[PDB]
Ligand binder design. Sequence first.
Ligand SMILES: Cc1cnc(Nc2ccc(N3CCN(C)CC3)cc2)nc1Nc1cccc(S(=O)(=O)NC(C)(C)C)c1
Ligand SMILES: Cc1cnc(Nc2ccc(N3CCN(C)CC3)cc2)nc1Nc1cccc(S(=O)(=O)NC(C)(C)C)c1
Ligand SMILES: [Cl-]
Ligand SMILES: [Zn+2]
Length: 289
Amino acid sequence: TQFEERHLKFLQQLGKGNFGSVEMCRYDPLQDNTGEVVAVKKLQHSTEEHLRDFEREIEILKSLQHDNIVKYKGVCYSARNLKLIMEYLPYGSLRDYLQKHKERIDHIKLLQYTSQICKGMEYLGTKRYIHRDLATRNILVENENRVKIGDFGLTKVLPQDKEYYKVKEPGESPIFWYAPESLTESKFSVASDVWSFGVVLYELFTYIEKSKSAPAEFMRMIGNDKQGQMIVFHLIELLKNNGRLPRPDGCPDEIYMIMTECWNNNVNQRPSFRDLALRVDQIRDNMAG
Ligand SMILES: Cc1cnc(Nc2ccc(N3CCN(C)CC3)cc2)nc1Nc1cccc(S(=O)(=O)NC(C)(C)C)c1
Ligand SMILES: Cc1cnc(Nc2ccc(N3CCN(C)CC3)cc2)nc1Nc1cccc(S(=O)(=O)NC(C)(C)C)c1
Ligand SMILES: [Cl-]
Ligand SMILES: [Zn+2]
């Protein structure tokens, strides 16, 4: 569908990166506040080089149709301040949702979200797309039973002849948990996306930790703000466990085994998303029956 810039009413700013920003807006052509609340992505700097990259991102999202991938609604043109219109997911990032509503999340629920991430990611690989920044930050919550991969700003299309994508520039990327070959050789692949998911899996089973323990006790103790404090906690746990991520308290051995496998140093020795989803689904079925 088509959208007119003048009918987009600003409500709240959701996120700000170095290249773009996402705002919570109402598309109100009737001018009576009855309009639909949408998520709007815009460029921080409007240049031909930035517009070409944004157009590639829009074309990637438009080509994706899956239950665990944020819905594309349309675009907002002018000539040339291009804006991407998406559905608004009200519960925000999985990172924030887990911390705010841990009291109502159990292992059956964490596994449901895990399967959903895995399925969304396997669909991504189907189109030969590399996410490059899979995080609990960009996995968003529609409701208590559905999560979606909500940002594709760093998504690359794999060359037909190669199984990796080499980024020939360091850049100011929000990527933190680099796979060994992405840091050393700048190579991004499905295997590096699998590395990124292992960390996501670890975080999920960390936020669930019963009450007042290690993740809650840390966030209390610190005398600063948010977002960057969560990596500080993980860096401490990593430092306490000889450089390798520990098994979160209460985490089943089966899920830790999956974490471990995703963190294999060798590219070709990491599990696939399809098999990961199938494995997670078996664990969930055994918990129920
Ligand atoms: C496409 C989309 C749909 N719904 C929502 N919902 C949303 C997201 C974040 C919040 N947070 C913002 C921060 N905090 C104060 C709590 C609420 C709330 C709702 N967000 C969407 N996109 C999005 C919003 C913020 C951040 C991200 S992002 O993926 O981290 N990437 C950039 C834009 C920051 C670079 C993506
Ligand atoms: C953004 C960033 C930039 N440089 C480095 N360098 C780095 C960090 C730790 C090591 N370690 C790994 C563990 N080992 C026991 C000692 C050296 C080596 C290089 N790390 C960064 N992030 C990061 C921090 C902690 C862990 C991880 S990671 O996701 O485990 N991936 C790496 C270490 C294989 C790259 C990534
Ligand atoms: Cl400590
Ligand atoms: Zn610029």
